[PDB]
Amino acid sequence: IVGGYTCGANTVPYQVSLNSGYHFCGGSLINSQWVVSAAHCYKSGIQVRLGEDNINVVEGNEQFISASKSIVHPSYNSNTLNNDIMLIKLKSAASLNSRVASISLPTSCASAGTQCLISGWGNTKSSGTSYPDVLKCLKAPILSDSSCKSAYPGQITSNMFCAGYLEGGKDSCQGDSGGPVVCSGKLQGIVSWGSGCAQKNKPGVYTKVCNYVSWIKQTIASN
Ligand SMILES: [Ca+2]
Numbered sequence: 610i611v612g613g614y615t616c617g618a619n620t621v622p623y624q625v626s627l628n629s630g631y632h633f634c635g636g637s638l639i640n641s642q643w644v645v646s647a648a649h650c651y652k653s654g655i656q657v658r659l660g661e662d663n664i665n666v667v668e669g670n671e672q673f674i675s676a677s678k679s680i681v682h683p684s685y686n687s688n689t690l691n692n693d694i695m696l697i698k699l700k701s702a703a704s705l706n707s708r709v710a711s712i713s714l715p716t717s718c719a720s721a722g723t724q725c726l727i728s729g730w731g732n733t734k735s736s737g738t739s740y741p742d743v744l745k746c747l748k749a750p751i752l753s754d755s756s757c758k759s760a761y762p763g764q765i766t767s768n769m770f771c772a773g774y775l776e777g778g779k780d781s782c783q784g785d786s787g788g789p790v791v792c793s794g795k796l797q798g799i800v801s802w803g804s805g806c807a808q809k810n811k812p813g814v815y816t817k818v819c820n821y822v823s824w825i826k827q828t829i830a831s832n
Contacts, residue, residue, distance in 0.1 A: 612779035613733060616746040618662035619670055619708035621728045623796075624744060624789065626658040627697075628673075635729045635788030636697060637796055638711050641704075643829050644676075644697040646787035647799050647816065648685040651695055655679070660709045663743050664730060670708045675700040680828055682821070691766050693801045693816045696828055714826070715795040718819035721753040725772060725792035727813070729785020729800060735777070735807040747781060749773040751792070752812055760810050768820050770798065771812040780807035790815050 625644055627634040629652055636646030636657070644657055660670035678698035685692045703709055719725070727747045733739045749772045757771035758764075765771075772790065773780050781788070782803040790798025798815035805811045818825075 613745055613747050616728060616744040618668070618743070619660065621726075621744060621746070621789075622708050622710035623712035624661070624728050626661050626664055626730065627652070627787065628656045628658050629654060632664050632730055635785045635800065637789040638703060638709070639714060639796070639825070640711050640829070641702040642699050644699065645796070645799065645818070645825065646695050646697060647693045647801055648681045648695040649687065649690065649693055649801070650787040651679060651681055655697065657697065657699060659703055661744070665742050672703055672709060674703060678832060680832065682824070689764070689766070690802050690814075692768055694799060694818070694821055696825065698832060712789065712791060712796045713794060714822050715797055715819040718817065719751055719792045719795075719797045721751050723751045723792050724748055725751060725790050725797060727772065727781050727788065727790050727798070727800065729781060729788035731781070731785035731788075732783040732806070735780075735805075747779060749779065749813070751797075757812065757814075760812055761804060761814070765814070768817050769801065770815050770817050772798065772815060773812045775810055775812070777807045777809040777811060780811070781813045782806035784813075
């Protein structure tokens with residue numbers, strides 16, 4: 610399988626589903642009490658769902674915990690999607706185990722050509738509407754900034770990166786907003802946006818988490 614595939618149940622134990630009566634976004638557990646997602650996923654009355662695979666069926670490993678708090682990045686711009694990052698605090702601590710685990714924050718930014726893992730539940734179809742029920746995965750390289758910016762001239766900031774293939778075919782667009790991009794075991798990316806869907810010279814665009822680590826640590830410690 611070159612591209613999107615079924616992860617396997619609980620193979621991505623940091624992966625979280627944000628539910629408002631339905632699954633609406635992804636997010637990542639970064640410690641027992643906190644979740645990172647995209648600021649475009651901001652909503653009232655989130656329930657965070659951990660240990661999911663099939664989000665429509667109770668399979669036994671789940672943990673369902675209300676969000677108590679959401680903090681959108683102070684410089685989030687919802688027009689440009691610049692600084693598309695939000696922190697979500699859990700009402701009760703998650704219970705950590707094999708299937709429900711934190712993902713580390715990066716100590717450095719990952720370089721172009723680094724292979725990363727992108728996960729989520731969202732739409733599989735570049736052309737049409739098909740929403741799958743178990744966790745899906747994609748492995749794609751981080752693209753060079755030149756290649757990213759040339760695909761979206763005037764749209765890419767320092768706080769974004771692109772990942773995938775310049776030919777398209779394989780991408781995450783609506784393919785799970787707020788979901789993780791993990792590279793060498795560290796959280797590098799958040800599924801942010803992407804013009805079209807797996808279009809030729811239209812990659813995925815991700816929030817560059819390595820720019821935010823000071824923000825995330827300071828904010829979680831003070832809240
Ligand atoms: Ca389930």
